[PDB]
Ligand binder design. Structure first.
Ligand SMILES: Nc1nc2c(ncn2[C@@H]2O[C@H](COP(=O)(O)OP(=O)(O)O)[C@@H](O)[C@H]2O)c(=O)[nH]1
Ligand SMILES: [K+]
Length: 306
């Protein structure tokens, strides 16, 4: 069984993350671009491009009207179903607040879930300087996303203001937000790709993300002494997340290292995750021994059950 992963960007921000992720390099992952704006769709790097609402918008965007984005997605449902067909897992990424992403993303996610695919949502909330009316429209879209996905990850754009200095280019900040989705997809792709000493597969991912709600996906790489503890702290500690690790009652943790991987340091990483959750976590533990890795360790964490 080779799992089919698809990343679908809905709207301007979602299709921007898709384009940037394609530049960074992402194989075995098929990309789908959905948008009402034909101008931006023509500039997409994705192999599957779907233009919605051409009759409602005449090629333009939703003009901040979520109703238009929702109607455009439903009118093009069969075109979305065809592009998704065959996918075992789908990542719907979109920026909430606008018309297309706010109204179309929940429709694309509902279609994916009804297509029988594991549907994960990675959406952003608008900056506070964009106004309160846009934060309210984004909340409705977030609530609509949570009802149509198996698992949801919200990234408030204000958190970007915490990881930047006064000169950080805006594009460099957006790339930090893109890492949440990209590395979460790569971690899942790597898990299904290699057979581990303590093996986890796509069935484990389904059991941890199926019909849960909020979730956290993080990866952490470290070296030297205390690498296990430091890697685990990086995988669960992200300043861009609305849903933290605290309160998680279900975790899928995979530690990847060389032949030096110690049982003692594996328990350290697990304890770090459970202690940080401050809950009695139902954990699914896996271990992969990559002899190429020298003194570096990788901790992948998928946390749900909030
Ligand atoms: N982090 C991030 N947020 C974005 C990006 N592009 C747009 N957004 C956010 O997404 C919201 C909706 O914008 P957009 O997706 O382009 O509108 P739409 O195409 O009509 O859905 C905006 O309020 C932005 O705050 C991006 O590249 N990165
Ligand atoms: K595996």
């Amino acid at each position: 069984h080779m799992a089919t992963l698809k990343v679908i960007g809905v709207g301007g921000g979602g299709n921007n993350a898709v384009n940037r992720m394609i530049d960074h390099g992402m194989n075995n992952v098929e990309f789908i671009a959905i948008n009402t704006d034909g101008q931006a769709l023509n500039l997409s790097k994705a192999e599957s491009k779907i233009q919605i609402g051409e009759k409602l918008t005449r090629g333009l965007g939703a003009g901040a009207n979520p109703e238009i984005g929702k109607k455009a997605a439903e009118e093009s449902r069969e075109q979305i179903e065809d592009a998704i067909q065959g996918a075992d897992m789908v990542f719907v990424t979109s920026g909430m607040g606008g018309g297309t992403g706010t109204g179309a993303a929940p429709v694309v996610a509902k279609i994916a879930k009804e297509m029988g695919a594991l549907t994960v949502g990675v959406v952003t909330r608008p900056f506070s300087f964009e106004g309160r009316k846009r934060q309210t429209q984004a909340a409705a879209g977030v609530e609509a996303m949570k009802a149509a996905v198996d698992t949801l990850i919200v990234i408030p754009n204000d958190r970007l203001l915490d990881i930047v200095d006064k000169s950080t280019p805006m594009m460099e900040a957006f790339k930090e937000a893109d890492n949440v989705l990209r590395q979460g997809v790569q971690g899942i792709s790597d898990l299904i790709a290699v057979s581990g000493e303590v093996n986890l597969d796509f069935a484990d991912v389904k059991t941890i993300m199926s019909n849960q709600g909020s979730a956290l996906m993080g990866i952490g790489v470290s070296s030297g002494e205390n690498r296990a503890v430091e890697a685990a702290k990086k995988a669960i500690s992200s300043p861009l997340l609305e849903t933290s690790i605290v309160g998680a009652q279900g975790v899928l943790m995979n530690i990847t290292g060389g032949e030096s991987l110690s049982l003692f340091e594996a328990q350290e990483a697990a304890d770090i995750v459970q202690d940080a959750a401050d809950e009695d976590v139902n954990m699914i533990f896996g271990t992969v021994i990559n002899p190429e890795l020298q003194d570096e360790i990788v901790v992948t964490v998928i946390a749900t059950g909030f």
